[PDB]
Design a protein around this ligand. Structure first.
Ligand code: CMP
Ligand code: CMP
Ligand code: CMP
Ligand code: CMP
Lengths: 74, 203, 203, 74, 73, 73
DNA sequence: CTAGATCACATTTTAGGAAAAAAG
DNA sequence: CTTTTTTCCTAAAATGTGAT
DNA sequence: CTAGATCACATTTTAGGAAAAAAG
DNA sequence: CTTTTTTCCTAAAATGTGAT
């Protein structure tokens, strides 16, 4: 498993724009996020190139990325 | 944080290359070494008739024009063209050699990348000698899903590339790459609509 | 006299390889670097069916098995087989790295050779993508007249090689190499009798 | 031109075996030698692999080789 | 069908999509499923992303576009 | 022809070649040019290098092997 | 024997930038 | 207000076609 | 359209080492 | 005398063949 994947998405300190999209897509934990795919996220309303890029960049600075493949979830 | 690369860059001239511009012309004199700070380029070679063939894509982090640095008066061995827009660190061979004699680590990092390219290019040779076009294309779709700019996608990795280009990678006609992309779709191996291709089963 | 190479060799284990023996098996772990003191080897790769393809000949002076030296836990990327009988200097990667930190010149010499191989191999790619079999063979006869063991001959350079082998170099069947060697003879470009071939107009 | 190519073949200090073959093939000057081709020399009587090799090796230690292509000769 | 008579709002669309339908006179989900894809794209302020959101919210609820209905209203 | 009547010695061969001819009863150059290549190779102590020396010393003098002569001797 | 290349042009698909709509 | 998303547009590039 | 691959086997050609002949 | 060249030998490897 991993310890960071269970913290809320807020521990990433995103912008208001990004934060509001995740919370309206039911993404509460960082573990839910890393499982979501890039193409999948772009379809979510109010999330465009700059927000998508901010997310891939805040995850990268913390070892993680998108489209990660997890087991035993939740 | 990376001490060596930071030090290296601080001795370079940084220069922006617009998308689709040529950084290196095959045949020209080789006296400068490049390092891709941001962007991506395509390393290509040509036959007499002018037909193109994509040797390799290089990305952020990769050195370019390193091959002329070991023997005097060598000529650029291939065209290098900016795929996207690039920001490139530049340093003269002469002055780069001086860095090496201050800290050989930078030379290690350069040689690491050379070794890799030799392994990758050698494989390309095997692919051309051993695989039919379907095999080389299938292989190339897998290698393109490895690149940085490839997007993660539920069914597998999603990529943006033209049929014409794939043709220049695996060395065949664009008409043929089209036919085969259509077959690999019946065989439910990929999803192709436009420049957008989802390579099933990566990730 | 050559100070650096002499120093390098004095830290190596020298080992004799009989003709036709394998120095390196593709897939094996890479932990040792080789240097050809005497002899010549063939660097080759294989497809699943077992078909062979000669990536390159290396001769006295050339390093072998250098590609595993930059990343940890890499695997030999190709078979290396003694063409003639070879005497080979050997040194563990671990201990070679220690030499580098004493005198980076040796690393320069290794990287020089890598750069060359990349240029040569890249060209092989172009040859496969651009030339028909006659073109690749003609090209290969010219490149074989460049080798050390090629004998000077009045009409042009004389070489010893089999049709089967040429086939494994340019990537085609041996029957075909035979037909073409017979055509290049009507066109008075070469003289072929046995393994002995005179490549007209070199030298 | 070159200065060494006009000295007699003797300045190479060959073996008796090699020396006797050249002098019966009319090769007096080092300039005549470097012009001769390897395949051509091997046919000359009493000259085999070891002598041919000694010659290619004594020339190599002195910059030269066989099958060299010269102008203005003599 | 029961769902085809509920207002379009029961789909919970974005403000952008909601405003386009209400200016095109599409009040009931039944009116929507009858509209064709090519037809919708012409409607002002509705582009690839909104059109895609609509086809995706209908798909998650069994329905789709260009459906062929009888007895309407 | 005038040259075909001179002894084989006028060719200045090697000791090895000279000794093979004289033990095969080839005294005159005319006897030689009549002999065939395959035939000569069978003669003891005569191998590729000697056979080649002979074909090369005859060629430099217009002649060759397997020549077909009349009125001999 | 078969895999691929080949031909020109009507049609499809893309790049990317101004401008409008919506969110912050 | 400002910034980001999303629409909406066309020259130009990319594409399929299928018998030999 | 064409360049090449393909098939098995009778025939050709080679490697290389003992031994003989000749030169040193 | 010794050393180098040259002969001379056969298992095994290399080769051509040519219509589809
Ligand atoms: N096979 C290859 N793979 C990756 N990069 C290459 C290859 N061949 C050439 N290049 C790059 O293209 C450059 C052309 O200029 P240089 O010869 O100076 O250096 C060359 C390499 O940096
Ligand atoms: N394209 C090539 N040209 C020359 N040598 C090569 C090539 N590819 C591999 N090699 C050599 O074969 C070796 C196989 O083992 P290594 O990967 O350690 O190092 C490799 C190189 O030394
Ligand atoms: N390339 C072509 N040119 C002309 N006619 C064609 C082509 N392809 C199909 N047809 C009918
Ligand atoms: N490879 C072959 N097999 C059988 N017969 C053949 C072949 N080549 C020519 N003929 C007649």
């Amino acid at each position: 498993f991993d310890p960071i994947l269970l913290r809320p998405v807020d521990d990433l300190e995103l912008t208001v724009r990004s934060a509001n999209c995740l919370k309206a897509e039911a993404i509460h934990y960082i573990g839910d996020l890393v499982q979501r795919t890039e193409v999948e996220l772009l379809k979510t309303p109010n999330l465009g190139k700059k927000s998508l890029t901010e997310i891939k960049d805040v995850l990268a600075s913390r070892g993680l990325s998108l489209g990660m493949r997890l087991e035993n979830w939740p | 944080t990376d001490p060596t690369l930071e030090w290296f860059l601080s001795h370079c001239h940084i220069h922006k290359y617009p998308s689709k511009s040529t950084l290196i012309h095959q045949g020209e004199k080789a006296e400068t070494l490049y390092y891709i700070v941001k962007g991506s380029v395509a390393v290509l070679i040509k036959d007499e008739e002018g037909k193109e063939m994509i040797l390799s894509y290089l990305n952020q982090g990769d050195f370019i024009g390193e091959l002329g640095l070991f023997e005097e008066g060598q000529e650029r061995s291939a065209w290098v063209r900016a795929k996207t827009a690039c920001e490139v660190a530049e340093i003269s061979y002469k002055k780069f050699r001086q860095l090496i004699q201050v800290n050989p680590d930078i030379l290690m990092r350069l040689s690491a990348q050379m070794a890799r390219r030799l392994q990758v290019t050698s494989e390309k040779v095997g692919n051309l000698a051993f695989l039919d076009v379907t095999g080389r294309i299938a292989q190339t779709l897998l290698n393109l899903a490895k690149q940085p700019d490839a997007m993660t996608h539920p069914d597998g990795m999603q990529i943006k590339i033209t049929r014409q280009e794939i043709g220049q990678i695996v060395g065949c006609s664009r008409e043929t790459v089209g036919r085969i992309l259509k077959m690999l779709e019946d065989q439910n191996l990929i999803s192709a609509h436009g420049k957008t291709i989802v390579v099933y089963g990566t990730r």
